[PDB]
Design a protein around this ligand. Structure first.
Ligand SMILES: *[C@@H]1O[C@H](CO)[C@@H](O[C@@H]2O[C@H](CO)[C@@H](O)[C@H](O)[C@H]2NC(C)=O)[C@H](O)[C@H]1NC(C)=O
Ligand SMILES: *[C@@H]1O[C@H](CO)[C@@H](O)[C@H](O)[C@H]1NC(C)=O
Ligand SMILES: *[C@@H]1O[C@H](CO)[C@@H](O)[C@H](O)[C@H]1NC(C)=O
Ligand SMILES: *[C@@H]1O[C@H](CO)[C@@H](O)[C@H](O)[C@H]1NC(C)=O
Ligand SMILES: *[C@@H]1O[C@H](CO)[C@@H](O)[C@H](O)[C@H]1NC(C)=O
Lengths: 72, 72, 136
């Protein structure tokens, strides 16, 4: 059940290739285009592709959001 | 080299511990507000390599530093 | 009152801009050496940038020269302060906010004259801002 969910995360990283500025290589900017996003500046830009742009993870197991259509 | 204005070709990994003692013997007041990071290997070779944190955070960070990085 | 004095205060050192130059980071084993002919080219590039700012923004023509850029505190790391003065009025210092706007207008032109890349030619207090990414 969960072993075929790890393969769906591997397929999401295979679809996100075929581009030379790789999506996990740089931070996005703010609303006001002056600096990077606040949790991409403290952590790594690779952590702001797995936790916020792929998973969109929350702060606990006790609150869950929605179905997150791109991982569906 | 920015707090005491030295040229760049004098301070390197071979004599970093030699010259930081020379800076507190010269200016003991201007050396107090400077910060020095404490880092050494076996602290970077032992980190959070938790589940789903090696193929996505460790490998995808190292691929972006190879040439022809969309191929790898 | 306060009895005694400080040897750090100056009557010009609040309109000065600190410049830091890292030659061996940008080029490395192939970088020129910074003699006083390079300081002459730096003072002419700043005087050129002040001429372009007053012409295109303030609509005035002012003949700034290299003798109107006053350099103090030259170090080996390659760092100094500078401030800009009106062409023959020695008492007229251009404010720091107008020199920052003039350097931002012509920063790409000063970098190309020395082969530096905005991390090897730092104007302390002036930061690069723009550049939104995208294309897909
Ligand atoms: C040189 O610049 C100074 C300002 O730094 C000028 O002094 C001003 O003079 C006018 C009238 O003479 C006064 O109303 C201002 O208050 C003065 N400014 C200051 C800051 O005191 C001076 O006139 C300039 N000299 C020349 C020849 O242009
Ligand atoms: C950033 O820009 C947006 C415009 O989309 C504006 O609503 C917001 O107030 C700005 N934030 C700051 C801190 O100025
Ligand atoms: C997940 O992303 C959506 C938009 O893509 C956003 O509205 C939502 O707040 C995100 N969830 C969390 C927990 O940040
Ligand atoms: C840097 O300068 C110091 C003092 O002049 C000198 O002792 C040292 O050898 C220099 N470092 C070099 C040349 O790598
Ligand atoms: C300078 O700092 C070091 C520790 O970083 C200390 O051992 C040394 O005694 C200090 N020197 C002076 C003159 O305070």
């Amino acid at each position: 059940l969960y072993y075929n969910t790890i393969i769906s995360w591997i397929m999401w990283y295979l679809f996100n290739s075929f581009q030379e500025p790789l999506p996990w290589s740089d931070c996005p900017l703010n609303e006001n285009q002056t600096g990077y996003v606040d949790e991409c500046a403290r952590s790594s830009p690779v952590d702001y592709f797995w936790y916020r742009e792929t998973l969109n993870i929350s702060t606990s197991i006790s609150d869950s959001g929605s179905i997150q259509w791109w991982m569906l | 080299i920015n707090g005491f204005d030295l040229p760049e070709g004098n301070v390197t990994q071979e004599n970093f511990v030699d010259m930081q003692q020379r800076c507190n013997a010269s200016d003991p007041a201007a050396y107090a507000q400077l910060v020095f990071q404490t880092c050494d290997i076996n602290a970077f070779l032992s980190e959070a390599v938790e589940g789903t944190g090696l193929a996505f955070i460790v490998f995808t960070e190292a691929i972006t530093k190879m040439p022809l990085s969309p191929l790898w | 009152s306060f009895v005694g004095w400080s040897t750090d205060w100056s009557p010009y050192a609040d309109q000065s801009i600190k410049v830091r130059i890292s030659l061996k980071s940008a080029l490395g084993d192939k970088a020129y050496e910074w003699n006083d002919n390079e300081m002459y080219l730096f003072r002419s590039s700043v005087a050129y940038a002040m001429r372009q700012y007053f012409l295109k923004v303030k609509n005035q023509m002012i003949l700034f020269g290299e003798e109107d850029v006053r350099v103090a505190n030259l170090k080996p790391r390659i760092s100094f302060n500078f401030f800009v003065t009106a062409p023959k009025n020695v008492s007229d210092i251009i404010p720091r906010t107008e020199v920052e706007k003039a350097i931002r207008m012509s920063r790409s032109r000063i970098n190309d004259a020395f082969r530096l890349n905005d991390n090897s030619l730092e104007f302390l207090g002036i930061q690069p801002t723009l550049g939104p990414p995208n294309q897909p």
